[PDB]
Every structure is written in structure tokens, then in C-alpha cells.
Design a protein around this ligand. Structure first.
Ligand SMILES: *[C@@H]1O[C@H](CO)[C@@H](O[C@@H]2O[C@H](CO)[C@@H](O[C@@H]3O[C@H](CO[C@H]4O[C@H](CO)[C@@H](O)[C@H](O)[C@@H]4O)[C@@H](O)[C@H](O[C@H]4O[C@H](CO)[C@@H](O)[C@H](O)[C@@H]4O)[C@@H]3O)[C@H](O)[C@H]2NC(C)=O)[C@H](O)[C@H]1NC(C)=O
Ligand SMILES: *[C@@H]1O[C@H](CO)[C@@H](O[C@@H]2O[C@H](CO)[C@@H](O[C@@H]3O[C@H](CO)[C@@H](O)[C@H](O)[C@@H]3O)[C@H](O)[C@H]2NC(C)=O)[C@H](O)[C@H]1NC(C)=O
Ligand SMILES: *[C@@H]1O[C@H](CO)[C@@H](O[C@@H]2O[C@H](CO)[C@@H](O)[C@H](O)[C@H]2NC(C)=O)[C@H](O)[C@H]1NC(C)=O
Ligand SMILES: *[C@@H]1O[C@H](CO)[C@@H](O[C@@H]2O[C@H](CO)[C@@H](O)[C@H](O)[C@H]2NC(C)=O)[C@H](O)[C@H]1NC(C)=O
Ligand code: NAG
Ligand code: NAG
Ligand code: NAG
Ligand code: NAG
Ligand code: NAG
Ligand code: NAG
Lengths: 52, 52, 513, 52, 61
């Protein structure tokens, strides 16, 4: 949660942080992609483990 | 010509933008016809993989 | 200075009957930014065929607006009598960066004529009148809403066919019912349709002349007239002030049948407007000519970030108020909602701070407060958090104990106690969103349901109403993944909800009708 | 809804973004008053233009 | 001093209502928003302009 990570609840920070908002958008979306890949890997691996 | 005034006014190709960006997209190595020749060679190799 | 014509020669003003109870109606007409209501077209350039995110002066989603009701005056049924108004002249608001108004919201509907609640009539669009300036105060008889020196007056006239924008010193007249005379309530403007709204010959000075009964116009620096096409079309109009002057905006000249507001005029007012109020207005009609008028609504502008959807014709036909809810913050960052899943982490709940704790040898009880989230100042050490009575860790007699990250762990107080500091705790949030059914449910994770309710006072976003639609009838359901609202216990086993919650849990979408 | 198909689509998208990012950076300021040299020159005195 | 109202075209320097650059103008259909003069793209570059001669030109730089 970039808004909280960068500054611990301060408005002056948020006012200046706003100028950089596109950065944190990239951070969360990039991590969103990585977490999805982690989940697909785990389920796809266990799928091969299971017997009929 | 399609990124020039001597062409459709509607072109908005990212390629046209390259004339300003200083960026160039490079051509593919094989062309569709050679790639087709290589996979038609595989099709003709079917029947078969037995007889050692 | 500007010659704005002669003073009124009337020895007295019309008496104004202020009867707010008759105007005390409920009819919100909110801005819905999803259709780009209230959106002012960005200035200096244009775009088309694009969705962008932009920070600028906009009204916010759901603003209902302050409702301004204009009405028929008193009448004998043969002739008009006294004016009948709402108490608007004293309703002084901060101008700040400007505001917008919705005009004619009720036009073509049928409803009360206000002065006589049992009587209804077709509702007509009427243009709003305003008084604005850099300084306000009281009148000599103790009434509020006096503007000083040159005051900006926005006074529609000609039965809504011209706008008179002017900046003059308003010199109050001393006659009966005038601002500097006997039995003054509130000045109000008026027109008398019986003589003033004659077809082909509207009295283009009717409201100016009534205004002039209460104040003389002096040392005018300007007076400009704009024409208004008469119609009953829903209209956006508004005002802002910048270093270059006062900007008058409307949808009327550029997007009459749409609503995007565009600038149409700038007034040479360089004295920052700090205050404004609505000029009360009454129509001197007779009972047989008593009409109903649409209320106008005033919404404030503020620097907000919106997603603005520009069609091929360059008009904004949709907008997203990014901070309205958790899902909307995500839509702006992720452009849309069916993008991938809509299942993303969302902005968390802040904490909600309490009164402080202060200690320093060098109003009650602030020695300690245990606890939840309290501001503090201890021997020059500041922060916010919750103190817990706990055992001491060292070093003794050095007062403030810090952790591996150099944060305060705890403190030795002058009451002999040692407190552990946990700073404040907060509620993390995630949203499970289904782009197919357009629905969602939410988790508070580790917070657990013992601290969860359908309403929150923390808070993470301005509104939680999209969940409340269903969640208001359920308690929170506790799961191994986290505490969730809108879960419904079904005891089902499914291979893939496309909304897995991890572990061995899954959020199953419902079935389309 | 076909995962292999989606991967084909991402290979395309991944190349598209590599260029879109180079292209969008051409309009990005970098602490600069403007991303446009022409505007830096037009509205600034020479002693300030070099810094921008 | 004339004729510099328009020149179509190849690569011409320009100054339009305080907006500067260099490029070729093409006579083309309007895209909006009407009456706001200068239309910009996804990268904030000028796409085209509504001139005082009533024409809309597309800019290809
Ligand atoms: C509705 O209300 C509006 C308010 O705007 C009236 O508009 C004003 O009308 C008056 C006349 O009724 C105008 O005043 C006269 O203007 C004549 C020429 O105007 C031009 O030149 C003057 C020079 O001072 C400028 O101020 C003005 O802006 C124009 O550029 C003058 O020749 C007149 O002078 C004569 O009368 C004056 C006294 O009023 C004497 O002092 C002079 O010696 C001389 O005898 C006069 O100044 C006024 O300018 C208009 N104001 C605006 C803001 O436009 C409408 O007329 C009124 N309509 C109805 C139906 O009542
Ligand atoms: C009150 O009633 C009036 C009268 O019907 C409504 O005005 C009408 O509103 C419609 C919708 O915008 C207008 O249609 C437009 O026509 C133009 C013509 O080119 C077209 O380009 C637009 O796209 C749209 O179709 C209609 O013309 C207009 N009537 C008049 C006389 O202009 C009014 O909107 C209603 N007001 C309220 C508050 O409901
Ligand atoms: C704006 O108007 C106010 C009042 O109309 C002026 O302030 C008055 O100044 C006189 C000067 O002797 C005082 O006696 C009054 O008591 C003041 N009144 C108030 C309410 O303060 C003010 O000077 C005017 N400003 C300008 C720029 O003309
Ligand atoms: C319009 O301007 C005139 C001056 O050009 C104002 O007249 C002065 O008003 C102040 C108010 O305190 C007096 O102290 C001065 O002595 C007046 N000067 C003259 C020459 O009489 C006039 O008051 C202004 N109009 C209004 C309504 O404020
Ligand atoms: C107006 O008069 C009332 C009388 O009680 C007073 O309370 C109020 O503060 C006054 N306002 C101003 C601006 O002086
Ligand atoms: C409004 O229209 C009337 C029509 O005669 C014209 O005389 C007047 O000058 C116009 N006013 C404005 C502000 O356009
Ligand atoms: C909008 O984008 C589409 C993409 O195909 C294009 O065909 C259309 O002409 C564009 N319209 C405008 C106003 O640029
Ligand atoms: C709570 O305060 C008392 C005060 O005497 C102290 O003795 C006790 O140890 C404190 N609690 C903890 C966990 O230390
Ligand atoms: C759902 O109902 C079953 C009934 O046995 C219960 O065991 C389970 O804990 C319930 N889950 C929730 C989240 O209420
Ligand atoms: C060329 O200019 C004419 C001027 O009338 C205009 O009508 C025409 O549409 C323009 N060309 C294009 C492609 O729009």
C-alpha cells in the first residue's frame, strides 16, 4: 500500500507523493503479475502430482 | 507514404511515430513463406517415426 | 468610472418576507460523474478518443448540492404584494477555488409553487443570482452578509434572458425596508412578469432596477451583459478565480444538450473572492399567474483526480472519482474494471486518532491514555500510538527504548510505569471483484471479525455503499484467509472460483439470471 | 479463456509495451520544466535553458 | 510576410496561438473537441488544429 509505505499518514507527504503516483501504480501491477505467476505455478505443479 | 501528408490523414501507427522518435522496428528474419516451408517439411515427415 | 444608469428614485424598497419553512423541501439532484456530470472541460487544450487521469477542479461524486429555491411573491389574486424569499442573502460560503451550479434540474416537472404548498405548477428554469467578494461583515442594523467595497454581482435579468455581471460599490439606500432604513430584513431582487415578461419585450432591467432600490451603484469598474437563449434545458454553469480574473463557465454555448462546462467569459476581478451568497429572489406574479420554479443546486469545486473519458468528439462522457471508493481507486490505477480480475489489494483503513498524551518536566487527563491510537509528546519525542502496560526492557534510567529499525519500543514514564508502544494498528483490506456480475465482497485479513462491522469509522475510502447494498443484512463471516463481508456460508467445494482466496478457500461468483 | 492462447497474446503485448514505454518517455519531464526542448528554449533565458 | 497562413506541405516551422513546433499540415476531418483549437494525442503531442480559415489540419510533424 504505497500511500502508507512511503509516508506514515502525513498529508504533506501525500501532496508531494501524488506527483509520483504513476510509480506506485507500476509497483502494484508488476507485483500483481508476479503473484499470479506464483499461483499458477503451484496449482499447475500439484495438478501433475495427483493420480486418477 | 501512409505516414506522410501524401496519404490517409487517419494513420496513427506507432510506426509513423518512429520518424520522430528515432526508433526503428526491425524486420523478421524468416518471412511467412520460409516458415511455412519449414513446417510443411515437418508435415511431410509424418508417417512415420517407427521402423527405427 | 462606468455609467450604469441612474439611481432609483423610489423613496422606499419593497418589503421582503423571509419564510424559510416554505422553502424547506428535500430534492437532491446529485452529480453523477459516471455520465460526467459537473465536469468542467480542461482548459488550454483538447483530446479525443482517450481515457486519461487528471488532477484539477471538479465537483465530487454524490454531491447532492445546496438547494436554492426561488418563488412567487405574495399576492391578493389581482395584484402582487410583498416579496417572498428564502434566507439566502446571509448564506455566505467560502469561494476558494470556485463552485458550480446545476440550473433547471426540475424543469418540465410539476410541483409546488412554494408560497402556497397545496398549489402546484409546471416548473420553469430560472437563472441564479449571486453576490461575491473579498470581504464580508454586518449591516448597520445587525444583519449579516454585507459585502465591502466593490462587490461582484451576478444578476440575471429580463426574465432569464440576459446576465448582468457587474462590479460596483453598493451604497445602501436609507428608505423604508432598504438596507440602511426602517424594518429591513433582507434585500431581495424581483421581477413582475405581468409587465416584465411581455412576449417580444421583456423588461431587461427588471431585476437590475429592483436591485437598485436597495443599493445605488457606485464607482463601477464594469458591467457586462451576456445574452441567454430561453429554454428549459438542463444546464451546467459555474465560476472560478485565477490570477488572470474571474472565469464564468457554462455548457450553454458549447455543449447545450450535453453538459460539459466550458469557459465563456472572464470578468476583471483581481481581488480574491473569499465569500459568496445567493441573492434571494421573488417573482411578483399573481395567484392566477403563480408558477413553480426549478431549484438550482450549488456544488463546490476542489482539486480532485478523475479519470476522464473523451469520446471521438472530444467531450467527456464519463468520469471516475478516483477516491470515492476502494474499487474506484483501483479503476483509475488499472484504467477499467473488467481488466483482468478486479481482485486486487485496496487502500487500507487508517486507524482513527484519539486525544493526546503529553509528558515533559521543564488539560487533563493527558498523562496517559490506554488506549487505541493517541497522539503524543514525551520529553521532545513525538508520534502517535497505543501504550500498553508492560514489563521493562532496558536500559534503565535512559527513558526511551528503540527497536532494530530505530523506532520507539517503549518508554519509562514519570509515574514509575513502563509502557510498550505499538504505534497504531490498522485494518488491511482486499476486494474480491467479479467483472461478470459486477459484484464484490471484501476481506479485512488478520483483523478478524471480532473487530468488524458493516460500518466503519477508520476509514479507508469515502464510501462503502457498494458492499452495504447486500452486506447490511449480514454479520461478518470469519474464515482462515481472513474476515469477510458479503461471504454467505454455502458449504460448497469447487475447483476454481476464479477468485480463490488461497489456502483451501474460494469465493464463488453467483449465477446470472 | 485458453491459457496457451493468452500466453501468445502476452508475447505480443510485451513487445508492444517495450516500445510504448520508450515512446511515452519522450513526453516525460525528468524534474525538468518541460519534456520539449523547443518550449524550454522559447520561454526561458539561455542560463536556465541548459539546466532544463 | 505572405503567404504564411498555411503551407501544405512537407516540413514547415510554425507558431499557432502560442503553440510552436515544426511539421506538415494535412487537410483532414475534424476530431474533437470543437472550439478548443488544439487536439493532442496519447503522448500529449499535437494531433491537429482548428484554424481561423475554418479548416482543420492534421499535424504529422
Ligand atoms: C438597463 O440598464 C443598463 C445598465 O447598463 C443601461 O445601460 C446604460 O444606459 C445608460 C443610458 O441609459 C448609458 O449611459 C449613457 O451612455 C452614453 C454613451 O455611452 C458610451 O460612452 C460613455 C461615456 O461615458 C461610456 O460610459 C459608455 O460605456 C459608452 O461607451 C453617454 O453619452 C450618456 O451621457 C449622457 O448622460 C449622462 C448621465 O447618465 C450625463 O452625465 C452626460 O453628460 C450625458 O448627458 C450616458 O453616459 C450607460 O453607459 C449604459 N451602461 C452600460 C454598462 O452599458 C440600459 O440603458 C438600461 N435599459 C433600460 C431599458 O432602461
Ligand atoms: C425540458 O423539456 C425540453 C423540451 O423538450 C428539453 O429540451 C430538449 O432536450 C433534448 C435533449 O437534449 C434536445 O434534443 C437535442 O436535439 C439536438 C438537435 O440537433 C441534438 O443535436 C441533440 O443531440 C439532442 O437530440 C431538444 O432539442 C431540446 N429541446 C429544445 C427546444 O432544444 C429539456 O431538456 C427538458 N429539461 C429537463 C431539465 O428535463
Ligand atoms: C471598504 O469598505 C469599508 C466599509 O465600507 C471601509 O472601511 C471603513 O473605513 C472608515 C475610514 O474612516 C472607517 O471609519 C470605518 O469604520 C471602516 N468600516 C469598516 C467596516 O471597517 C474600507 O476602508 C473600504 N475599503 C476600500 C478599499 O475602499
Ligand atoms: C467613489 O470614489 C470617490 C472618490 O473618487 C469616493 O469619494 C471619497 O470617499 C471617501 C470615503 O471615506 C472620503 O473620505 C473622500 O473624502 C471622498 N472624496 C471626495 C472627493 O468626496 C466615493 O465615496 C466612492 N464611492 C463610494 C460609494 O464609495
Ligand atoms: C453581526 O452581529 C451579530 C450580533 O450578535 C454578531 O454576533 C456577529 O458576530 C456580527 N458579525 C459581524 C461580521 O460583525
Ligand atoms: C441581446 O440580444 C438583443 C437583441 O436585440 C441585442 O440588442 C443585445 O445587444 C444582445 N445583448 C448581448 C449581451 O448579446
Ligand atoms: C478512435 O480510435 C479508433 C481505433 O480504430 C479509430 O478507428 C478512430 O478513427 C479514432 N477516432 C478518433 C477521433 O481519433
Ligand atoms: C502493569 O502495571 C503494574 C504496576 O504495578 C506492573 O506491576 C505490571 O508488571 C504491569 N504489567 C506488565 C505486563 O508488566
Ligand atoms: C459454515 O457452516 C459450517 C457448518 O458446519 C461451519 O462449520 C463453518 O465454520 C461455517 N463457516 C463460516 C465462515 O461461517
Ligand atoms: C479538405 O478541405 C475541405 C474544405 O471544404 C473539407 O470539406 C474536406 O473534408 C477536407 N478533407 C478531409 C479529408 O476532411
Amino acid at each position: 500500500d504505497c500511500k502508507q509505505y512511503v509516508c506514515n499518514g502525513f498529508q504533506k507527504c501525500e501532496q508531494l507523493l501524488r506527483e509520483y503516483g504513476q510509480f506506485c501504480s507500476k509497483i502494484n501491477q508488476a507485483l500483481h503479475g508476479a503473484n499470479l505467476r506464483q499461483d499458477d505455478s503451484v496449482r499447475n505443479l500439484f495438478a501433475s502430482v495427483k493420480s486418477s | 507514404d501512409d505516414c506522410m501528408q501524401q496519404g490517409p490523414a487517419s494513420a496513427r501507427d506507432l510506426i509513423c511515430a518512429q520518424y520522430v522518435a528515432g526508433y526503428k522496428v526491425l524486420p523478421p528474419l524468416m518471412d511467412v513463406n520460409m516458415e511455412a516451408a519449414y513446417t510443411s517439411s515437418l508435415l511431410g515427415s509424418i508417417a512415420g517415426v517407427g521402423w527405427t | 468610472y462606468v455609467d450604469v444608469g441612474p439611481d432609483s428614485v423610489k423613496s422606499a424598497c419593497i418589503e421582503v418576507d423571509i419564510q424559510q419553512t416554505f422553502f424547506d423541501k428535500t430534492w437532491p439532484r446529485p452529480i453523477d460523474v459516471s455520465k460526467a456530470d459537473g465536469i468542467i472541460y480542461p482548459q488550454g487544450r483538447t483530446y479525443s478518443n482517450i481515457t486519461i487521469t487528471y488532477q484539477g477542479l471538479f465537483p465530487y461524486q454524490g454531491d447532492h448540492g445546496d438547494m436554492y429555491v426561488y418563488s412567487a411573491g405574495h399576492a391578493t389574486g389581482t395584484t402582487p404584494q410583498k416579496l417572498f424569499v428564502a434566507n439566502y442573502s446571509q448564506d455566505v460560503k467560502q469561494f476558494a477555488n470556485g463552485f458550480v451550479v446545476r440550473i433547471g434540474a426540475a424543469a418540465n416537472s410539476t410541483g409546488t409553487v412554494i408560497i402556497s404548498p397545496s398549489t402546484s405548477a409546471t416548473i420553469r428554469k430560472i437563472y441564479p443570482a449571486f453576490m461575491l467578494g473579498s470581504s464580508v461583515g454586518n449591516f448597520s442594523d445587525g444583519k449579516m452578509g454585507r459585502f465591502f467595497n466593490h462587490t461582484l454581482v451576478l444578476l440575471p435579468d429580463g426574465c432569464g434572458t440576459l446576465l448582468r455581471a457587474f462590479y460596483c460599490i453598493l451604497e445602501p439606500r436609507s428608505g423604508n425596508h432598504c438596507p440602511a432604513g426602517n424594518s429591513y430584513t433582507s434585500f431581495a431582487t424581483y421581477h413582475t412578469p405581468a409587465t416584465d415578461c411581455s412576449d417580444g419585450n421583456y423588461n431587461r432591467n427588471a431585476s437590475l432596477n429592483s436591485f437598485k432600490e436597495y443599493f445605488n451603484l457606485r464607482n463601477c469598474t464594469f458591467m457586462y451583459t451576456y445574452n441567454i437563449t430561453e429554454d428549459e434545458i438542463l444546464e451546467w454553469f459555474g465560476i472560478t478565480q485565477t490570477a488572470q480574473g474571474v472565469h464564468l463557465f457554462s455548457s450553454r454555448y458549447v455543449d447545450l444538450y450535453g453538459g460539459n462546462m466550458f469557459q465563456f467569459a472572464t470578468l476583471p476581478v483581481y481581488d480574491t473572492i473569499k465569500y459568496y451568497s445567493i441573492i434571494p429572489h421573488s417573482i411578483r406574479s399573481i395567484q392566477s399567474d403563480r408558477k413553480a420554479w426549478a431549484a438550482f443546486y450549488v456544488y463546490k469545486l476542489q482539486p480532485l483526480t478523475f479519470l476522464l473519458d473523451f469520446s471521438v468528439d472530444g467531450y467527456i462522457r464519463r468520469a471516475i472519482d478516483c477516491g470515492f471508493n476502494d474499487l474506484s481507486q483501483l479503476h483509475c490505477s488499472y484504467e477499467s474494471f473488467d481488466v483482468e480480475s478486479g481482485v486486487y489489494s485496496v487502500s487500507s483503513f487508517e486507524a482513527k486518532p484519539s486525544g493526546s498524551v503529553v509528558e515533559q518536566a521543564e488539560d487533563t487527563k493527558i498523562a496517559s491514555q490506554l488506549g487505541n491510537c493517541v497522539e503524543y509528546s514525551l520529553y521532545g519525542v513525538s508520534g502517535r500510538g497505543v501504550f500498553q502496560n508492560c514489563t521493562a526492557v532496558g536500559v534503565r534510567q535512559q527513558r526511551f527504548v528503540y527497536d532494530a529499525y530505530q523506532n520507539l519500543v517503549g518508554y519509562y514514564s514519570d509515574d514509575g510505569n513502563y509502557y510498550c508502544l505499538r504505534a497504531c494498528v490498522s485494518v488491511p483490506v482486499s476486494v474480491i471483484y467479479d467483472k461478470e456480475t459486477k459484484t464484490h465482497a471484501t476481506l479485512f485479513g488478520s483483523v478478524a471479525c471480532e473487530h468488524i462491522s458493516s460500518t466503519m469509522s477508520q476509514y479507508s475510502r469515502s464510501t462503502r455503499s457498494m458492499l452495504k447494498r447486500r452486506d447490511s443484512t449480514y454479520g461478518p463471516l470469519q474464515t482462515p484467509v481472513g474476515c469477510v463481508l458479503g461471504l454467505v456460508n454455502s458449504s460448497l467445494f469447487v475447483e476454481d472460483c476464479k477468485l480463490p482466496l488461497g489456502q483451501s478457500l474460494c469465493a464463488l461468483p453467483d449465477t446470472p439470471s | 479463456t485458453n491459457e496457451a492462447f493468452h500466453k501468445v497474446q502476452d508475447a505480443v503485448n510485451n513487445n508492444a509495451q517495450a516500445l510504448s514505454k520508450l515512446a511515452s518517455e519522450l513526453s516525460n519531464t525528468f524534474g525538468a520544466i518541460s519534456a520539449s526542448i523547443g518550449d524550454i528554449i522559447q520561454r526561458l533565458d539561455v542560463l536556465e535553458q541548459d539546466a532544463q
